[PDB]
Amino acid sequence: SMQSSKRSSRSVEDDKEGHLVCRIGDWLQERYEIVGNLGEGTFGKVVECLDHARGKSQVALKIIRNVGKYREAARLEINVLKKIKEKDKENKFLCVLMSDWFNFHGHMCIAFELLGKNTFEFLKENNFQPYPLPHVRHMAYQLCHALRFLHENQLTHTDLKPENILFVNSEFETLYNEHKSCEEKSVKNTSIRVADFGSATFDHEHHTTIVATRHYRPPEVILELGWAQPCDVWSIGCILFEYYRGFTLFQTHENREHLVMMEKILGPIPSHMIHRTRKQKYFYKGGLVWDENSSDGRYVKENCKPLKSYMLQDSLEHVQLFDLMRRMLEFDPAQRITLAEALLHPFFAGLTPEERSF
Ligand SMILES: O=C(O)c1ccc2cc1OCCOCCNc1ccn3ncc-2c3n1
Ligand code: NA
Ligand code: NA
């Protein structure tokens, strides 16, 4: 401790952007001691703290800028994290646990129990070599379990992506791959938690038009047809593909190209979704407008193949993963598999009793 807790907690000022001026060794609430930097953003900063009222246990503390639009968004996030904590008092459903929140001189602060690396960071540090199928299976099972509980409590996350899924502990072992003739990092424990509820929407609330990060965004969002819980199911199917291959299913940044890639990989969009959309400019006599011969057309033709073509092995457990991913990636959100149904899919017969029982 370079600093004393009472003195440090009262010595306070903001910068011109409305960030809290702070550094390692500072205190908040005479309770939280800053020991590391974890992230910065337009919203504020994230620091690692020791919680001196709970045995110096480690927390991630979000410190939101002293700016009204960020303060208000944080207040809405806190109200969602409160409703989740209230419905899962014993944390069986694998959501990040908000341990505390407070207003620090205009800065909204949100504490979470400290976890390991996110699932994107781990993949990146493994040179984008994919997770082995048993790890994909256990992670898929935890995602279905976590989001089924939110969905059955009238909530949709809307922004599921590998960066928002955190390992409880990301320590790995280094195994040598016979087939790759080169070494792979294998996480020792595949237990995960779902983070980032700042976009989560209840059934009765106003639904923003464009939700989810591009790669994880479903066709009903792109076509502006309305969205609900099935939006999260599509995102999970994209995430599973990415854990299994190490690259994104939809490598695009434009709506028309994205819908074309969905057709190349998944088959035709249902005609009723095309009929209903305002985005008629994407279509001609009911078909997507697309030049197969342009530079983008040649890229998509070479790179975007039917989903089953991406299987790495053709044993039944690989067939079962691909069947479940195809059901998560149904175009029509009303026919898309629900997470209550996904938990009964035969893919999950391959779990160990320990993985199944949590
Ligand atoms: O928004 C949430 O719900 C959220 C929940 C938990 C954590 C962070 C969060 O958001 C801030 C992300 O930026 C910091 C990234 N690094 C780390 C590192 C270790 N942990 N352990 C928990 C979190 C964490 N974040
Ligand atoms: Na201070
Ligand atoms: Na909802």
Which domains are seen in the chain, by residue range?
Answer: 1-91+96-114 (3.30.200.20), 92-95+115-358 (no CATH)
| Rounded CA separation 39/37 (Å) | 6
- Dihedral of alpha carbons 284, 290, 291, 292, sign: negative
Q: Residue 87: name the closest of 153, 8, 177 by CA.
A: 153
Q: Residue 117: name the closest of 233, 25, 177, 39 by CA.
A: 39
Q: Is 168 annotated as a binding-site member?
A: no
Dist. CA 96 → ligand 2 center (Å): 27
Indicate if 291 belongs to the active site: no
- The DSSP secondary-structure symbol of 212 reads S
Structure-token pair, residue 59: 């927390």
Q: Cβ contacts of residue 103 below 8 Å, gap of 6+? A: 109
For ligand 1, say whether the CB of 60 is within 6 Å of any of its atoms.
Answer: yes
List the catalytic residue out of 26, 159, 196, 232.
159
Atom 16 of ligand 1: nearest residue by CA position: 38
Give φ, ψ of 61 to 5 degrees. Answer: -115, 115
DSSP letters for 232-272: HHHHHHHHHHHHHHSS-S---SSHHHHHHHHHHHH-PPPHH
Dist. CA 116 → ligand 1 center (Å): 9
Resolution (Å) of this entry = 1.7
Q: Is 38 annotated as a binding-site member?
A: yes
Classify residue 263 as exposed, middle or buried by CB count within 10 Å of its CB (0-12, 13-18, 19+). middle
Q: For residue 152, give the 3-state DSSP assignment.
A: coil
For ligand 1, say whether the CB of 192 is within 6 Å of any of its atoms.
Answer: no
